[PDB]
Amino acid sequence: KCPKDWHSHQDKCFHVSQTSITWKGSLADCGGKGATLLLVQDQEELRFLRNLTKRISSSFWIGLSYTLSDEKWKWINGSTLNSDALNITGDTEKDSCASVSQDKVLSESCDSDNIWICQKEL
Amino acid sequence: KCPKDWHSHQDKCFHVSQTSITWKGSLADCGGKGATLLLVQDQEELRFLRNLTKRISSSFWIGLSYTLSDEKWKWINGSTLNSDALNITGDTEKDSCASVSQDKVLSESCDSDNIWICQKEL
Ligand SMILES: *[C@@H]1O[C@H](CO)[C@@H](O[C@@H]2O[C@H](CO)[C@@H](O[C@@H]3O[C@H](CO)[C@@H](O)[C@H](O)[C@@H]3O)[C@H](O)[C@H]2NC(C)=O)[C@H](O)[C@H]1NC(C)=O
Numbered sequence: 001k002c003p004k005d006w007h008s009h010q011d012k013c014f015h016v017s018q019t020s021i022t023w024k025g026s027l028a029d030c031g032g033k034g035a036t037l038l039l040v041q042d043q044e045e046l047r048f049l050r051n052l053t054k055r056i057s058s059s060f061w062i063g064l065s066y067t068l069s070d071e072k073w074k075w076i077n078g079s080t081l082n083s084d085a086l087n088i089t090g091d092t093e094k095d096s097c098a099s100v101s102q103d104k105v106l107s108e109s110c111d112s113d114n115i116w117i118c119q120k121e122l
Numbered sequence: 123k124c125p126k127d128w129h130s131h132q133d134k135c136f137h138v139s140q141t142s143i144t145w146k147g148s149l150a151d152c153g154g155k156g157a158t159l160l161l162v163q164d165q166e167e168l169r170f171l172r173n174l175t176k177r178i179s180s181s182f183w184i185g186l187s188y189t190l191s192d193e194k195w196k197w198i199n200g201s202t203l204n205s206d207a208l209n210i211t212g213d214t215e216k217d218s219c220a221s222v223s224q225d226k227v228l229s230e231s232c233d234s235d236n237i238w239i240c241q242k243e244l
């Protein structure tokens with residue numbers, strides 16, 4: 001199904017942003033649409049979105065972050081990141097937030113501006 | 123099922139906040155938990171949460187707002203509000219946001235601070 005201007009794929013709907021924003025701003029944005037940032041299901045899904053976002057270049061925020069007090073990478077669903085379901089690359093001496101480039105997954109400052117993608121589940 | 127410190131009810135899990143915040147801050151908060159603000163299902167559900175939040179008093183933000191350029195009340199899922207599935211009370215000369223008190227549902231400035239509740243669906 002999905003709504004107008006969102007792209008369907010398996011049991012999920014995606015909306016790619018038209019602007020770039022901080023990680024926390026992107027949380028508020030997908031929140032106002034009754035959605036969340038991305039919980040990556042497969043390397044298949046990561047392929048599909050990498051294509052969809054090819055034209056935009058940029059690298060898009062996902063629902064995955066590192067808070068220094070936790071001492072670990074965590075998806076917004078509460079699960080710890082599996083390092084070889086998905087391999088994040090970059091430093092972690094501060095709170096960081098993950099984005100997905102064409103070739104990598106990046107630890108970045110949560111105050112960087114990136115494109116984001118929102119998901120809703122059918 | 124649900125996770126630790128969330129309350130189950132029908133097919134939904136709820137978490138009540140421990141602080142009070144603006145509407146947009148609450149969007150970011152439930153976003154970081156892979157959740158959304160409340161989409162009220164029944165007057166049954168509004169009863170259950172009004173009890174759960176009885177001890178906090180206060181009035182909790184929900185996933186419903188009015189943006190002046192739209193000219194109508196809309197849930198975060200995109201649907202327009204049915205005024206007698208749920209009746210909102212208060213003015214609308216500016217963008218507003220809805221909270222649920224013990225007796226009413228209130229139009230408020232989106233910059234007010236309220237308690238909020240996040241929902242995940244099983
Ligand atoms: C929190 O979100 C993360 C990211 O979506 C979830 O991680 C994903 O969990 C699924 C389901 O358990 C994993 O899929 C599995 O793949 C193997 C095939 O190799 C198969 O044996 C299983 O039947 C299943 O399909 C998936 O790999 C995994 N993705 C990543 C990137 O780690 C996590 O489950 C979520 N937490 C929940 C739903 O509580």
Ligand SMILES: *[C@@H]1O[C@H](CO)[C@@H](O[C@@H]2O[C@H](CO)[C@@H](O[C@@H]3O[C@H](CO)[C@@H](O)[C@H](O)[C@@H]3O)[C@H](O)[C@H]2NC(C)=O)[C@H](O)[C@H]1NC(C)=O
Nearest residue numbers: 160161162163164165197198199200201203204206207208
């Ligand atoms: C967007 O969210 C709102 C708030 O959750 C949804 O409104 C709710 O929609 C449901 C399902 O259509 C309504 O329930 C219906 O109740 C009558 C009994 O009077 C029954 O005939 C139907 O079988 C159904 O159970 C519910 O009243 C309604 N709640 C409110 C407060 O309006 C709306 O559906 C959501 N949009 C979606 C899912 O796209």
